[PDB]
Amino acid sequence: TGYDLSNSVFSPDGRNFQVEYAVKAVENGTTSIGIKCNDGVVFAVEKLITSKLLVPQKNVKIQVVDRHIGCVYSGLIPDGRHLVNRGREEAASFKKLYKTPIPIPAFADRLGQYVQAHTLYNSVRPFGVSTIFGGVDKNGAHLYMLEPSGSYWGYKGAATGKGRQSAKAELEKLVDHHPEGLSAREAVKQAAKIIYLAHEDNKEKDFELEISWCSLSETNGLHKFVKGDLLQEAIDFAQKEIN
Amino acid sequence: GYDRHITIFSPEGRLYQVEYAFKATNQTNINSLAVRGKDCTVVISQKKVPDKLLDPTTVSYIFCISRTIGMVVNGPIPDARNAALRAKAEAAEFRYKYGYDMPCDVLAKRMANLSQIYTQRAYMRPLGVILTFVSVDEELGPSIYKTDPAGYYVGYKATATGPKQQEITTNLENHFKKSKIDHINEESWEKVVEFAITHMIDALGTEFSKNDLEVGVATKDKFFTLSAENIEERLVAIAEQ
Amino acid sequence: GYDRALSIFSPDGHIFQVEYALEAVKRGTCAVGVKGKNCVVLGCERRSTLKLQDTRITPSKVSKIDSHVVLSFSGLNADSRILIEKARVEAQSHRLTLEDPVTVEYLTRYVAGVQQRYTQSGGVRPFGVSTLIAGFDPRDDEPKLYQTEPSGIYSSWSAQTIGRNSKTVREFLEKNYDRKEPPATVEECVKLTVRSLLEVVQTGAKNIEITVVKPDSDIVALSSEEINQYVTQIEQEKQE
Amino acid sequence: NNYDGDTVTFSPTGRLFQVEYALEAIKQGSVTVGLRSNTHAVLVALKRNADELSSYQKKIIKCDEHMGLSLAGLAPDARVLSNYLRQQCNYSSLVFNRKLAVERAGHLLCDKAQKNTQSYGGRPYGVGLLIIGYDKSGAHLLEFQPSGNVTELYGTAIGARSQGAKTYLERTLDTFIKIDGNPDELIKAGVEAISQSLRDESLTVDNLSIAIVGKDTPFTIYDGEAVAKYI
Amino acid sequence: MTDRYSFSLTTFSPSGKLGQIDYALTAVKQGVTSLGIKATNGVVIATEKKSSSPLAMSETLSKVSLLTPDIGAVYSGMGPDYRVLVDKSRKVAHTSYKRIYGEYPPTKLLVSEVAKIMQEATQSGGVRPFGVSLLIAGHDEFNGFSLYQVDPSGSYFPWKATAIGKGSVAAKTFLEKRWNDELELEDAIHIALLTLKESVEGEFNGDTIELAIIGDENPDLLGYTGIPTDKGPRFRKLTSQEINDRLEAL
Amino acid sequence: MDIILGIRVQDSVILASSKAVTRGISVLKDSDDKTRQLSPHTLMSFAGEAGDTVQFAEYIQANIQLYSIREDYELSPQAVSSFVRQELAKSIRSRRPYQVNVLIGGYDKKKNKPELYQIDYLGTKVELPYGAHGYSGFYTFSLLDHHYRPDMTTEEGLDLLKLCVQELEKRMPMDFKGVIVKIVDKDGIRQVDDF
Amino acid sequence: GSRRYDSRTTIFSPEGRLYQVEYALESISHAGTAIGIMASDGIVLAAERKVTSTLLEQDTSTEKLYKLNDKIAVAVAGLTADAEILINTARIHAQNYLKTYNEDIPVEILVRRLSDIKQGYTQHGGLRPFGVSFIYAGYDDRYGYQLYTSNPSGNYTGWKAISVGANTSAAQTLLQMDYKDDMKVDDAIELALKTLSKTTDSSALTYDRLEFATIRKGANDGEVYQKIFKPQEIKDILVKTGIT
Amino acid sequence: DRGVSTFSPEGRLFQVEYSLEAIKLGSTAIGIATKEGVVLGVEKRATSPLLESDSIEKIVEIDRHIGCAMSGLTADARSMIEHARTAAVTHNLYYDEDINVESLTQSVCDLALRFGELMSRPFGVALLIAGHDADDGYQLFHAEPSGTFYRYNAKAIGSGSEGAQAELLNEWHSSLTLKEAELLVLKILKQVMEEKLDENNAQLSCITKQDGFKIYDNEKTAELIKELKEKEAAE
Amino acid sequence: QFNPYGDNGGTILGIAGEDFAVLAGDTRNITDYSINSRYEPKVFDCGDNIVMSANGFAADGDALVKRFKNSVKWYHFDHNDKKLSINSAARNIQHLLYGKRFFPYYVHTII
Ligand SMILES: [Mg+2]
Ligand SMILES: [Mg+2]
């Protein structure tokens, strides 16, 4: 025993227990999702209202990288910020040498290699977040999700955090009803709906909804926060659908 | 017993972290196979996309290391992508310094050396992956070289890796006992891809759709992967046999 | 680089590596210093099991740091060389910049600072050495004698002893050293220093080293026969 | 238990015990309150002495003309973090001729704190901070925990028995958030809040520490006879 | 990151043993047999090619390596550790000798440099010892032919003939009955093949055995003509056919 | 600064060094002693660039004194001269080299012989019966070439030195303000107060 | 992090000893015995090879006796590879001194520096100590013929006669009994060989189990010669002292 | 084992708490601030009677307007004093003024937590820092190896500190003369010391605006001890 | 060849009375024979009742004032809001200036 006391140790069955424990921190976090649409991506997150004293709209979780990439994560929030800071350095360096903004698959691997680097030594611990991210590049829309192991894949839809199981089931039905595609605007509404359904597994406190999107037609391939009327419309669609 | 946690010798002269790294290699439950033709080298790997939410085009364990070298990995994807990026850097640097394309066996040796270092220095863990490199080398012809967490590597007539490797290995052994040659006697890589798929089917005892495999092909001066459509064309031809 | 904090506090507020360094000093051969009215004498024990030793060449236990200051010790011999070399360098450096040789207090303060530093730096253990530093300040005839220890505390002594069985010889000095009337001569001072070692030694042979230091850079090590004359005189006087 | 030896180790349930032990020093610290209106932001703190011959430890530290903070926990760690803030506020003014946004100060503190929760040899910071300020978007109050989590609030409290003040501010929210253009009534509201954390001890002239920042009000600290007004 | 293992991983136990070196020698014990024999006019080094898979091509893996034109090496124990020692051995022959004196090192001095590399893996921070024993055979003008063994500790010994690995105890006994100071190279080769057969239960031929000599200068292996005082490498690897030709006269 | 001379006779080395220190248009000092005792039986005189002469001489003196304490033993004059030459040869390829020329006079107590070494600032060392640095050699070498004998006494060496100093006082453009003379023999180092 | 696997090679025990030095000395107590004996006209070093084999090539073999320069040699007891690291360091040190002073290095000065290097490994760096004890035999014109020993602690001492390795207690008793100050080199040769003969754990002492060397004034007046004995020369001196 | 920068479950740094235990074992030091000056006094505690007690230096000058007394592992104090002297002199060089007593104390306390795997452990010594400046007059601070410093009207540290602090709590008042403070330090040291207090096993010092920092002669202190036994005799 | 210095003209003037002091300066800024500005202030209130001007090469002058103003700010932070006396300001400015002894601020400073 003791195989789980130190990062980067293989157990006798080939596992890295510290990374598996990092996944527990992720599973403890709030629900976040990503939905891929015809010409873009949509991100949404559950923000638990700990107390009335939190200023509404003022603890923004979804972060932008460069001008075309959005990131959201569940688990240890500061670990997420650390990862986005690194992503921003990687995007700037790519842009500097190659002129073009970093493609999403390229960006995915930059984060992947950095997260994987923290599973190689006992002098660091793994990241306690799973990150959902994506955007629009020269080849269209891409959506990714990245685990504490450094493992990542492309996704039609993605979910993580405490309400991930309900969200996953809900995303799979979306992909079925809408097999020829989903518009950026229905995807925004559906994201609100799915966070609301996922919030039953966290029914204790109530929450605040945050949504963002990058769409070729709707945002010119730039990352934008969904605010005001369009958000209120998404809140309504979600409300009407649970009842 | 902290001799089991870092790469120092146990009382029987074993390196337990290296052995446990060999076990991480099978975690993905994928099997791969490589064979040489006259003019080409083919690698095939099983493809499994259990989650419907995945984009299946991004699920892959085959890598284009250079214009001439391909690599299939058996083991977790993070360690695989670590190995791939490094190999890409090594292959490009070699071309810059020495003025010619890095050979498949030379890259394999280089990657095996890095792996040996992880078995000797305490601060680095082994990567839990096995790397099968392929090309048509301008001097050696069709080439398969495979590397593991012990830092061991060697050239092969053909090889197989994964949980069901032995089934495939003995199937291939029995073929080369009959033919008495070092390769698949065929002009077109198409027929060599068909041989490779045929013998994986017969050895595993399973049928494959176009989405169940991924295929890599090395020819003179280029390595490339097949689309699902190219694979279907290949599956059709097998069915008429 | 190797960084480990080897000297650290334990729950009772003790630093064990410094206290275990003191145990090393206790195992070392006894050393004694006695200051007269115009001299200081440093006496040292040499172990009894080392015959076939070549005394021409074997490291002497009393070291000149400069021409007016000496250092002896108890503890690890190899450790003491490192402290002696540094002290020698600092003494020459002091003459170079100040244009004056070190005072005995200054030299003691330097060595004790080096000893202390090694009790709170990463990757090192404390010195297993306690020193007696004796001599005369430039143009001063008042004798000086200081003691340092692994922790780096130092202080001045009328007479002091360190090493194995130092409890016994300190007992002797405490009831034979009169502060109102210190040993008035070189002969008197040496005799008290030899008397104190005969409480603990064995033979008055090559088992006792004696170095006398007088004002104005006058330092000399005694020979076996000269030391042996003192031992002979003390034995006969104790017949009552 | 087997997993609290250092900051670089997850427990089997995904916890970081050294970070949680750092959070405990904040709980042993003296209570301090923060709250804001649309025009002003206010800090109130209960200072602690060693005995009757000693001074009362200062809890409030100025970071710039438009920003400052109060502390609970390891005071030397507050000094390190407030110094970093002072430099960051100062860098923004020298290089960009720009007053550092309070929200940006929060992000910079979070990232600085986080680095000490993921690397061997380090330890987490052992102090909680309440940052108030007035910038281009008005009044702000932040809460910083050494886990790295920074939150923007209308009002809050940290330290021992801060649950009383926190409960009170949660009940009083609708009223105090409207005390605009009346600095004295906002402070009185903060003193009421902190009184809900008192047990046995009461507010005296060298006990109480108050700070304010606002529309035309540089961050200023009142101690001693200057707080008599509010007792 | 940073390698924070700046302390020794090999240390003395209360009985005076250096555990990691003992365990490294145990890894060598379990390795395939290799041996070396010194004759009047040459040296021979031999070992079994224990191939891992039948699908592997065993001539793409050499256990016998040229270090310099007149010096060769073989091992028992961990192959990957051997492969990197050969890289460093070839390199140190240039950096610490050839680039200084314009000629290849004598056998004992190259052995000495390998030994140093192996000693340092036994004391330096954050590493384990090499899990191999080497046999290094060579020739140089002023010392003649020589054969050396290097162990995981860094120690090295000159031998008339020896064996290391699995069946080394029996092989050494076999070599003591056969060795004398009048052996010609062909006799040494013949004895090398006899000695190695005892430890091989399986197939025994030019494809399963690996054998090399240090002998006469091979002007045909030089690659150029014109400089009469350059006469070619004394190291030569025997071909599969050359070994089979000698197994009929066995 | 200016003139340094040395002559080795039968049983001693005599060093003579000028007393003037001159900055620009003013003689600042007429009693400067351009010498350091390195050990009881070794003396070094020096001339060259200002600041560097004394800095070099004292640095050497400190090292030889350190050696003497560590080993309880006086290095031979040959050993001291080799140490000094290495420092100067090291210095000539530094960022800012010591611009110092020296004479080393010592009595070797093991061989019972006087020895005179001349070392310039590049680290050019030679053992000679007599030596000089700068322009002083241009006048004094021919005098010494004529008069010098290997079996001369100390008193004969001093008289020969008087001829040299007289020639310099007659033909040199600069007023170097006389010399301080020191003798190194078996009994150590002493200064001739009347010269 | 890595703190878990650190043995802490440079700490004191509660009794104030250095574990790793103690354990290194325990290792050395199993090595072949090396003896040194100083006479008025030379020095003798003699050492036992650890149970050899008949296939070992003895004439080109060197495990106990090494040359540091023309005036100083050492006998080794312990890990040979550790010793070679230190020997090369000592060879360089001697040459640096010659280059600096144009005089051969005095014996004690070489001994002190090597012992300071060993001492360093016991106090800082966290590395294992060298498992080596040395006997130094040499000549200079200050003290003439000299014998010293150093061990893993980096402590060194001077001797008229000394042994290291196996059975030093027995060897030291035998040396003390028969040694005398007016003794000549040829008497010391016989003493060294006979002491090894009585203390050895082998069946009998033979030429093939020995390394032997002298440092003599034997030459053309006031000059010193180092002779490392060839195997046939050791065989002769064994017959000539009636041991075989 | 464990890290040198480890928090305990109660939120305390193990090494810092353990260094506080070493300070409890130290010889007693007392400081008393008045409006006429601050007095600093210490127990010397020679370990043997052959130790020349005037070489025991536990009261130290930092600058003309700042003095300091120590208790605990007193060898640890030397680098702290050195830093303080350098900080005081450097400040005067940069600003052509005396440095405030509190700024000096803060500078010394910044060293405290610069340990880890910087120095290998915290300091095992506590300081009393007494001084005068124009803005805040006479001041006494207690500088600890936790990095915390408190201002005090009166303070005792070392082994007799519990009993001594209780006594200072009764005796201190804002109108004490300097002479009364001197006597009060002597009285309280007399109470808690194991051996009988004389001019060789205890030492006094003070800092006044007018004359700066002074360590008292043994003869001056001897007179003050005589004055104190006479005060107590009169009722 | 790049020359890191220029000359921006201007003249400054300080006079001390019994209970007051003045620092005056023209507001013209020039290079060569051209006018850059007819109103570019050159004398600054630095806090703590201290005024300052650093005249000559304006880029260096601005850098120095900026550094001194910053020094007053940190003096307050590090020394409990103590007022920086004029003598203390003067000594601080000496170290700011001499710190660039081998690459000087090309200014004549008056406070
Ligand atoms: Mg490793
Ligand atoms: Mg010359």
D14 to chain A: which residues are within 8 Å by CB? 21-28, 128
Spatial strand order of the sheet with E65-68 comes to E65-68, E71-77, E132-140, E144-150, E156-158
Q: What are phi and psi of F24, to 5 degrees?
A: 65, -100
Q: Cβ(A85)–Cβ(D118) under 8 Å? A: no
> Which CATH number among 2.60.120.620, 3.40.47.10, 1.10.150.120, 3.60.20.10 corresponds to the domain C1-240?
3.60.20.10
How far, CA to CA in Å, does E59 sit from each of B37, B157, E199?
19, 12, 21
H29-33 vs H38-43, strand pairing mode: antiparallel
CA distance B149 to B27: 15
Measured between alpha carbons, how far apart are the two ends of chain A, in Å? 51
Going by the DSSP 8-state scheme, the letter that residue C200 receives in this structure is T
Q: Which domain holds residue H111?
A: 1-235
Q: How many CB atoms lie within 10 A of CB B148?
A: 23
CATH class of D1-231: alpha beta
- Give ∠ CA H121-H122-H127 in degrees, rounded to 5: 150
DSSP for residue B29: -
Nearest of C149, C169, C141, C79 to residue C108 by alpha carbon: C149
Helix (H, G, I), strand (E, B) or coil at H38: strand
Q: Residue F31: what residue type?
A: S
Contact at 8 Å (CB) between F61 and F38?
Answer: yes
Cβ H104 vs Cβ H129: under 8 Å: yes
Closest Cα to residue H119, out of H149, H68, H69, H79? Answer: H79
Q: What single-letter amino acid sits at G182? A: D
Give the tokens for residue G224: 């010193």
Tokens of H134: 């124009």
**Judging by beta carbons within 10 Å of its beta carbon (0-12, 13-18, 19+), is residue B239 exposed, middle or buried?**
exposed
Q: How many angstroms separate the CA of residue I23 from the nearest CA in chain H?
A: 22
**Whole-angstrom distance, CA of residue G11 vs CA of residue A240:** 72
Measure CA G140 to chain center: 18
- Give how many domains chain H has, as a whole number: 1
* Length of chain F counted residue by residue: 195
- Helix residue spans in chain C (DSSP H): 16-27, 77-98, 104-117, 166-176, 186-198, 224-237
Closest CA to C28 of C76, C83, C62, C63: C76
List all residues 6 or more positions away from C69 whose beta carbon is below 8 Å from its beta carbon.
Answer: C91, C101, C102, C104, C107, C133, C134, C135
d(CA F122, CA F97): 9
CA distance B111 to B86: 8
Task: Please give the CATH topology (third level) of the domain spanning G1-244.
Answer: Glutamine Phosphoribosylpyrophosphate, subunit 1, domain 1 (3.60.20)
**What distances in angstroms separate CA B14 from CA B118, B150, D209, E78, one per listed residue?**
15, 11, 65, 10
Q: How many CB atoms lie within 10 A of CB A102?
A: 23
**Tokens 């190291």, residue?**
E235
Q: Rounded distance, CA D190 to CA D31, Å? A: 12
Q: Which ligand is nearest to the CA of F133?
A: 2
Supply φ then ψ for residue E192, to 5 degrees.
-60, -40
For tokens 């500061």, name the residue: A78
**What is the domain partition of chain D in residue ranges?**
1-231
Q: Where are the alpha helices (DSSP H) in chain B?
A: 16-24, 77-98, 104-118, 165-179, 189-204, 228-239
Residue D156 to residue D173: CA distance in whole angstroms: 10
CA-based R_g, chain C, Å: 18
Tell me the domain boundaries of chain C.
1-240
Radius of gyration of chain F (CA): 16
Nearest to F150, CA basis, from F128, F173, F170, F176: F128
Q: Residue A242 corresponds to which amino acid?
A: I
Alpha-carbon H193 to chain mean position: 16
Residue E116 contacts residue G86 (beta carbons within 8 Å): no
H residues 90-129 near I, CB within 8 Å?
Answer: 93-97, 99-100, 102-103
Shortest CA distance to I21 belongs to which of I47, I42, I52?
I52
Query: How far, in Å, CA of A38 to CA of A32, rounded?
Result: 21
CA distance B135 to E139: 39
| Residue numbers preceding breaks in chain G (C to N > 2.5 A) | none
Which of H5, H154, H168 minimises the CB distance to D122? H5
Question: Closest chain G residue to A9 measured between Cα atoms?
Answer: G1
Place of tokens 């910038």: D135
Nearest CA to CA, how far is A123 from chain G (Å)?
5
Determine, for residues G5 and B123 on separate chains, whether the beta-carbon distance falls below 8 Å: no
* CB-based contacts of H146, cutoff 8 Å, min separation 6: D76, H13, H16, H20, H112, H113, H122
Q: Are H155 and H128 in contact (CB under 8 A)?
A: yes
Interface-testing mutation among H89, H93, H96, H102, with chain I (most I C-beta atoms within 10 A): H96
**Chain H neighbours, 3+ Cβ pairs < 8 A:** C, D, G, I
Q: Torsions phi, psi of F18, nearest 5?
A: -65, 155
Report the DSSP pairing between strands C159-162 and C31-35: antiparallel
CB neighbours (10 Å) of residue E81? 25
Residue A195: half-sphere exposure toward Cβ, Cα within 13 Å: 30
CB atoms within 10 A of CB G109: 15
Written as one string, the DSSP assignment of chain D is: --S-S-TT---TTS--HHHHHHHHHHHHSPPEEEEE-SSEEEEEEE--BSSTTBPBPP-EEEEETTEEEEEEE-HHHHHHHHHHHHHHHHHHHHHHS-PPPHHHHHHHHHHHHHGGGSBTT-----EEEEEEEEETTEEEEEEE-TTS-EEEBSEEEESTTHHHHHHHHHHHHHHHTT--S-HHHHHHHHHHHHHTT-SS----TTTEEEEEEETTEEEEEE-GGGGGGG-
Residue C236's alpha-carbon distances to C225, C231, H81, in angstroms, are 17, 9, 54
- Sign (positive/negative) of CA torsion A84, A87, A92, A93? positive
CATH code, domain with E13: 3.60.20.10
**Is-contact H68 H129, C-beta < 8 A?**
yes
What is the phi/psi pair of residue E184, to 5°? -90, 160
Distance A24 CA to ligand 1 centre (A): 27
Environment class of A216 (CB within 10 Å of its CB; exposed 0-12, middle 13-18, buried 19+) = middle
Q: How many residues does chain B have?
A: 241
Dihedral angle computed from the Cα positions of residues D156, D157, D162 and D164, in that order, rounded to the nearest 10 degrees? -30
Among the options A30, A119, A131, A160, which is catalytic? A30
Cα C240 from chain centroid (whole Å): 34
For G57, the closest of E6, E18, E160 (CB atoms) is E160
In C179-208, the residues whose Cβ lies within 8 Å of chain G are none
For residues C229 and C236, give the distance between their C-alpha atoms in angstroms, rounded to a whole number: 11
A 10 A CB-CB count for B100 gives: 9
Q: Is A100 a catalytic residue?
A: no
SS3 state at F107: strand
Q: Residue D130 pairs with which residues in a beta bridge?
A: D70, D143
Residue written as token pair 């000297």: C7
Resolution to one decimal, Å: 2.5
Which of C85, C43, C37, C47 is CA-nearest to residue C214?
Answer: C37
Check if the beta carbon of residue A69 is closer than 8 Å to that of residue A134: yes
Residue F62, chain C, CB below 8 Å: the answer is: yes
- Beta bridge partners, B159, equal B34
Question: Which domains are seen in chain A, by residue range?
Answer: 1-243 (3.60.20.10)
Rounded distance between C-alpha atoms, residue E1 and residue A17, angstroms: 19
H/E element, C205: none
**Tokens at D9, concatenated:** 């180790």
Q: Which residue of A18, A121, A122, A123 to mutate against G (max G Cβ within 10 Å)?
A: A122
CB of F104 within 8 A of CB of F77? yes
CA angle G106-G111-G117, nearest 5°? 135
Contacting residues for C97 by C-beta, under 8 A, at least 6 apart? none
**How many Å apart are CA D159 and CA D161, to the nearest integer?**
6
Testing the interface with A: which of B49, B55, B115, B127 to mutate, by most A Cβ within 10 A?
B55
Task: Return the closest-CA partner of residue F116 out of E103, F126, F124.
Answer: F126
> Would the CB atoms of E12 and G128 count as touching at under 8 Å?
yes
Query: Measured between CB atoms, which of B5, B6, B24 is closest to A14?
Result: B24
Residues E105, E98 contacting (CB under 8 angstroms)? yes
d(CA E4, CA B22): 26
Say if CB E121 and CB E129 are below 8 A apart: yes
Q: Do residues B74 and B214 make contact, with C-beta atoms less than 8 angstroms apart?
A: no
> Pick from H75, G119, H12: which is nearest to C15 by CA?
H75
Q: How many residues does chain A have?
A: 243
d(CA I103, CA I110): 20
Compute φ and ψ for F145, nearest 5 degrees: -55, -35
| Helix/strand number for chain A, H first, E second | 7, 10
Residues 6 or more apart whose Cβ sits within 8 Å of residue D73: D22, D25, D26, D28, D29, D126, D127, D128, D146, H11
Is residue F59 helix, strand or coil?
A: helix
Q: Exposed, middle or buried by CB within 10 Å (0-12, 13-18, 19+), for H164?
A: buried
Q: Which alpha helices (DSSP H) does chain H contain, by range?
A: 14-24, 77-95, 101-110, 161-171, 178-192, 218-233
**Cβ of D229: how many Cβ atoms within 10 Å?**
11
Location of structure tokens 């452990």 = H121
CATH class of the structural domain F1-195: alpha beta
C-alpha span between D144 and G133 (Å, rounded) = 60
**Using CA atoms, how far apart are residues A9 and D119, in angstroms rounded to an integer?**
17
Q: Tell me the C-alpha distance between H102 and H149, whole Å.
A: 9
Question: For residues A30-64, b (16+ Cβ closer than 10 Å) or e, as one string?
Answer: bbbbbbbbbbbbbbbbbbbeebebbeeeebebbbb
Chains that touch I (3 or more CB pairs under 8 A): D, H
CATH of the domain at H16: 3.60.20.10
Give yes or no for G2 touching B (CB within 8 A).
Answer: yes
Residues whose CB is less than 8 angstroms from the CB of residue C207 and which lie 6 or more positions away in sequence, other chains included: C45, C46, C47, C48, C201
Query: Is E19 buried (19+), middle (13-18) or exposed (0-12) by CB count in 10 A?
Result: middle
Range of the domain at E101: 1-250
- I17 Cβ contact list (under 8 Å, min separation 6): none
Helix (H) or strand (E) holding A108: helix A104-117
Distances (CA, A) of C209 to C43, C193, C205, F69: 6, 10, 9, 20
Domains of chain B, each with CATH number or no CATH: 1-241 (3.60.20.10)
